[PDB]
Amino acid sequence: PKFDVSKSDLERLIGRSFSIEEWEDLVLYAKCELDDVWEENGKVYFKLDSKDTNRPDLWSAEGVARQIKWALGIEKGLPKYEVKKSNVTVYVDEKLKDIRPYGVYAIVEGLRLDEDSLSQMIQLQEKIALTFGRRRREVAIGIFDFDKIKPPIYYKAAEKTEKFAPLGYKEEMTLEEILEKHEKGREYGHLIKDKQFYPLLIDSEGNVLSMPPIINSEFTGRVTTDTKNVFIDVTGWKLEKVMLALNVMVTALAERGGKIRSVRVVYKDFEIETPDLTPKEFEVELDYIRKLSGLELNDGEIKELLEKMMYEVEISRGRAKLKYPAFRDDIMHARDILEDVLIAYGY
Template sequence: MPTISIFKSDLESLLGSPGEPRTVSIDELQERLALVKGEVKDYQEDTGELRVELQDSNRPDLWCCEGIARQIRIKLGGTAEPYPFLSKQSGRLPRLLVAPELERVRPYVAACAATGYRVTEQGLAQLIQTQEKLADIFGHKRKTVSIGIYRLQKIRFPVTYELANPDEVRFIPLGMETAMTLSEMLMVHPKGLEYGSILAGQRRLPLLRDADHRPLSFPPIINSREIGEVLVGDDELFVEVTGTDATMVLLTLNIFAVNLADRGAAIQPIAVRYPFETPFGKRVVTPRDIGRPRAIQIETIERALGQELETTVVKQALETYGYQVSTGKKSVTVKLPPYRQDLMHAMDVVEDVAMSLGYGAFSPEMPSQFTVGGLSRIEQLSDRARELMVGLGFQEIISNILGSPEHYRDAMRLDGTEWGKMVEVRNVMSSNFSCLRQWMIPSLLRVEGASARSFYPHRLFEAGEVAIVDSAHEVGSRTETVLGAIIAHASAHFSEIHSCLDACLYYLGKTYSLEPIPHPSFLDGRVGKIVVSETPIGLIGEIHPEVLERWQIVMPVVAFEVNLSRLEQLT
C-alpha cells in the first residue's frame, strides 16, 4: 500500500496546537505509527523528510501527513476536535450545478472552498501528494475518483459540471503554454494520454466551468492553468472531486476538507444540485457527514478480544481513536468520523478498540483445545519416495514450477502432442515464466544442462507438483505430485535407472510392469510406460539425443517419472 513522503516539521506542527508544534523523536514516531498501521521506511535528517509506508488500503484518510497527525493527536489529546462545517448550514451556499447528461458518464461531484490558510511549500507538496495518492490508489487511477484544486478568487459561482463538445471548448491546461481543445488534450497532453481511456467512447466530455463560462478543468484529465494552478502563498482554495461512486466522491472531499481545516482553513460548503436522483438526494451539501450510528454489544467486543472490558473503557478507547460514541447498558453506539468509511462489520470496531488500547494491553494466551497434527496422504507418500531416492544415492533438487513452453514442451520434442499440453499464462511478463510444468523430467534436465562441470555420475530427483491439463476438472487442470529421477554419466543406460525404479516401487509396495510405447522425448525402443494395476503411472527410458542437444547436455541421460498422486489413489 502507499508510501508517502512527509516532513517531520510539518508533522510536528500538525501534532501540536496552532503556533505550538509538538516535537517527536523518530523512535517515538515509529511507536506511534502503530496507530495508523504505518512504518518509517526512511528518514533524511538534513531535509527532515520521512518516507512512511501505510498498510491499510481502507483508510485513505491516513495517506497524508494531516491524517497521520490527526490520528496521533486525538490519542494524545484524548478527544476528537469537531468539524463545524459538517453541521447544518444556514443561508445561501455557493452552488455547483450538474448537467443531466453526466448521469451516464461521471455522475457525482463534491466541492468546498477553503479560506484563511496560506499555502506553504510543505503544505502544497502534501496537497498534491494526497491528490495523487487518493486518485491513483483509492480512485483506481482516477476512474472512480479524481480531484481538482483551484484558486477560489478566480471563480464566479455557480459552477457548472456539464458535458462539452470536445472540439469546441478550449483552454490552456496545466503544464502547457497554449490553449487547446479537449480532443487535443487527449491526444497530446501527458495526462490525456495516461487517463484518456477512462473517457473512451464518449462523444461529449466532462467540463467544469464557472458562471462566466471560464473552464476550471476537464475532469478527470487536467485543470485549467489559469484557474487551476495553486501556488505557494495562495489562501483561497476551491476543491472539487468528481467520480462514479457517490460515497467515495463524498469521502474524498471530506478528507480534503478536514485536512485543510486541520491546517487552519475555514471550510465553506458548497450545495451541489443534481437533475437526477443520487444516493444522497438531488441537493447535496458537501462536505457531508456520511457516517451512520451503529450499535455494538460490549460482549461482541469482549468475545473477539478475549478480555472483559468496561463500557467506559471501550467508549474512551474509541473516542480517542476518532469515533463518536454513546453508551448503552451493555452496548456502545458508534459513529465513524467524516473522513472514514470503513466500518463494514463490528469486527472493524473491535480492531480499533484493540489498536487504541495498544496490542501490548492484551496478554497472550495459548489456545487450549487439543488437536491432532498430521501430514496429508500424498505428502506421506512423497516423503517415503524421497527417502528411498536418497537411499538410492540420488541428490534432491527443487525447481520453479512456472517456466517456459520452450523447456517443458519444445526442447522435449512434445510440440503438438498430448504430452505437450500445459497450463499457460495469459498475461505473460517474461517467456521464461509463462506456463506451469506438466511433468518433472525437464526440471531435472535444467539442472543437468547447467552442471556439466560437476563431477559425475549425476543422480538427481525431485518430488513436487505439476499441473496436468484436464478439461473435466473444475479449474481445467489437476495439480498432482510426481517423482522424477535422472541418471547421467558416460555409460548411463536403461537398466541402471530401471533398477532404481524397481527398488523404489518395491519398497512402496507396488507391483508394476513396463509396456513399450513411442514417446518423442526418449529413444525409440528404449522407453516404456510404467503400469500399476492396469493404470499407467509414469514413464521410463533413455532421453533422446536430440533432447539432450536442446538442453546442451553432452552425457547420456536415463530417466523415470512416477505420478505419486495417481499411485496414491490406487491404494
Template sequence: MPVISVEGESLNRLLGKNYAVEDLAEALEQMGCDVDDVLEVDRFRCPKCGSAVEASLGAEVTNRCNWCEYEQEGSFEKIGRSTVIRLDLLAARPDLFDVGGIARALKGYLGEVEGLPEYNVTASGVSVTVDPAVDGDTCRRPYIRCAVVEMDNVDDTTLVSLMKLQEALHWGVGRDRKLASIGVYDLDTINGPITYTTIDPDKDAFEPLGKAGERMTGREILEKHPKGIGYAKLLADHKRYPVLKDADGQVLSMPPIINSESTKVKVGTKRLFVDVTGISKSAVVKSLDTFVSSMVELGGRAQTVVIKQADGTELTTPDLAPREVEIDLEAARRWLGLPLNEQSLVQALRRMRLDANQISETEMFRVRYPALRTDFKHMVDVFEDLAIGYGYQNIQPQYAAQATTGLPRPEDEHSELVRSIMTGLGSSEIMSLPMTTEELHYEKFRLPIPKHYPRIANPKLKAMTVVRSHLMTGLMEHLRENRRAPLPLRFFELDNVTVLDENAETGAYEQRRLAIVEMGKEASYASIRSVIDAILFELGLEGTFAASDHPSYIPGRVAELTTTSEVHGILGELHPETIVNFGLDHPVALAELTLMKVES
C-alpha cells in the same frame, strides 16, 4: 503499493509538541500503519508555483514540479533538508493518506486530544449546476460533490501536502481516477455560479495545467499532454468530455484528466474550491469527506457548496456529520480476549478519536465516528480500533491451553508419493487454472456438453465459465503452447476436479486426480500403459484393464482401469480430431486416474 513521505517537522507542528521522529514512527507502527523507513530528503522550490519538491539525498538534478507540471533544464533551487517518515498506503484507511489525517490520529493515540473531532461547516454561497449531459449517451461521469476550504495562507508545505493527498486518494479510493478524481482550484480566480457540463473534444479549447499560453482542445490534451496521455483511456469511449466552467465560460478542469492553468492553486492562495467527480457515488463522497477534513487539520475552514442536480433536486456538500454504529461489550471481550469494562472501552475508543456512550443499562454502546472513517462497515471494524486504543503492547501473550501437532491431509500425503513417482518416470508437472470454457472442456474433446455441469454464474471473463471436471484440458493446452519444443513431451498434473453429486451436502465434491500426457511419434496405448503399470507397481496395486469406448480416443485403443482400491481411470491414444482441435500435429497418448475423494 504507493508510498508517501510525511515530514516529521510538519507532524510536530500540527501536534503542538516536539516528538522525536523515531518515536512518531513507532507510534504509527502501533496504530497499524506500515512504516517503511525514516530518512532524510533534500527539498527544492519550484520557480513557477513556489511549491516544495522532495528528492533523495544527493540527487543531482530536480527539475520537474509534480504539482504545476513545470519543467526546466537546470535543477530547482535547493531550500533545505528534512527528515521524513515513509509509509505504505493502506487502501482501507484513506484518512491516513496525508500529514493532516495522520496528525489527527496521532493526537488521540498520544493523548494530546481525545474524542470525536468536530467540524464546524458553514455555507460558502457557491453553487454548482449539473448538466444532464454528463450522464447521457455521449458522456458518463454523473456524480459530483464539492466544497470550499478557506485557508489563512497556502504555503509551500501545505501545497505539497494537498498535492500528495490528492494523488493518494486518486489511487486508494478513486482506482487511479477511474471511480473518482479530485480537482482543487483558487476560488478567487472563478466567477460563479459553476456549471458541470460537457464540451466537444475537437472544438472547445482551454489552457491545461503546465501549458500557460497554449490552448488545447480536449482531444489534443489526450494526445499531447503528459496527464492526457496517461489517462486517455478513461475518456476513450466518450463522444463529449466532462468539464467544469464558471459564469464567464472559463474552463476550470476537464475531469478526470487535468485542471486549467488559469485556476491553479499556488503559494499564497487563500480560498480553495474542491470538486470530486466520478462514476462511483461512494468513491466520490469518500474522497471529498477525506480531503476536506484533512485540509481542516491543516488550518482550513470547511464551507458547503449547493449542488443543483440534473433531476432538479439540490444537495449540500460536504456532510461531515458524525456517523453511528452500535457495538456489544461482551462481543468485544470475546473477539479480542481482553478484560474490558465500560470505562476501559470508552477510554480506548476516545484515544482513537471516537466517542462511545452506553445504551441504558445494557452492555451495548453507541459509537460515533467521523464521516472520514469510511472503513467502518461492521462492529468488528470498531473492535480493531478498540484493540489499537487499548494498546497491542499492553496485551499479555499467553500459551495456548493445549498444544496441537499438524499432520498432512491424507490426499496430500498420497499426492506427494504419486508426484515423486511421476517425476522419477521423467514427466514434468504443470499446474493449470481450475476454470475453463465449454469449448475447451467438452467440445474440443468431442464430448457432448452435459445438461448439468459446474458452470460459473455471471462470469467476469469469457475464458473462465466452467469449473473443471477433468484435468485433460490443462494438459492439452500446455502441449499446444509447447508444440515447437523438442519431442517427446511428457507432462502430468495432480490436482482436484469438481464432481456434481445431488447427495453431497453442497451438491458437489472434489476428487484428487492424476492426468498424464505424452506427445511424439512413439506416443501410443502401449507407451501410456507402461506408465500406468509403473505407477500401480509403486503404489502396490493391481489393475484390471478392459476395452472401453470414449469419444476423445481412437476406438480400440482406449481402456478403462479398475483396481481393488478407489483408484480408477481411463487411458489410450487420442482421436486425430481431438488432436487437431488443439492445434497439434503429432500422436498423443493421455491417461487420467481418479486417486481419491477429497474430504471436506
C-alpha cells in the same frame, strides 16, 4: 500506500516534537511503518507506508498527526467539524450521466499555505485518486484557488471542439487535441475519448478550470502558496465514493485551520449540500467486544479505548451507541469495532 512527509510539518500539526527514536513508536499509532528517513538541506523527511488500504484519511501528514494526537490524548472522542454554507452553487449536467456522472464540491477558507502544506494536499490528491479512486476512474480530485474563479460553477458535457490551455501549455487547444497531445491526455483519455462529449468544469465567465478526470487548466484557478481559499471538486461514478474522498480532503485542510464551507450542488432531479460531515453511526454490544477480544475490559475501559480511536461513545445497558468521523467508510461489521479496540489497547 506509501507517501512522503516532513518531520517538522507533522510536529507543527501535533503541536510537540519528538526524537527519531520516539517517532518509531508514533508511526504505528497512525497505522503505518517508517519506510525511510532522510534529510534535505538540514530538513528531515519520512517515507511512511500506510498499512490500511481502506483508510484514505490516513494517507497524509494531516491524517497521521490527527491519529497521533488522539493516541497521545491531546484530543479525544469525535473530532468536531463546523461547516457553514457558502453562497456558491455548482450545476451538474445530466448529460454527463453515462460519461462521468457525479461531482461534489467544497470550499475551504482562511488557509495559510507553504511548501509543506501545498505538497501534502497535492500528494493526497494523487494517493486518493490512484488507490481509492482506481487510477482516477472512480475518484478524481481537483483543487483550485477560489478567489480566481467566478461562481456559479458548471460541471458539464462539452463538445470535443471546445478549447482551453491545459496545465503546462500557454495556448488553447481543443479537448480532442488535449487527449491526443497532453501526457495526461494519453495516460487517462481512454476513460472518456469514445463518448460523445467530454466533462468540463467551467466558471460563469467561460473560464475552464479543468477537464475531469484528465487535466487542470494552465491559467484558471491555479493554487499557489499565496492561495487562501480553495475550491475542491471530486468526480466519479458513485456518489458515496466521491463524498468520502471530499470528506478526507476537507478534514485534512481543517487540520491546517481551514474553515469548511458547503456548496449547493444542483442535479437535474435533485440537489445536495456538500460536504456532509454528519458523524456516522454504529451500535455494538460491549460483551461482544469482551468475549471476542479475550480481554477483561469493563464498559468504561472500552469506552476510553474507543474515544482514542475517534469515536463518540454512549453506553446504556451494556450496549454502545457510537458515532465516528464522516471521513471513514471502512466500518461495516461488529468485528471492525473490535479491531479498533485491539489497536487502541496498544496505545
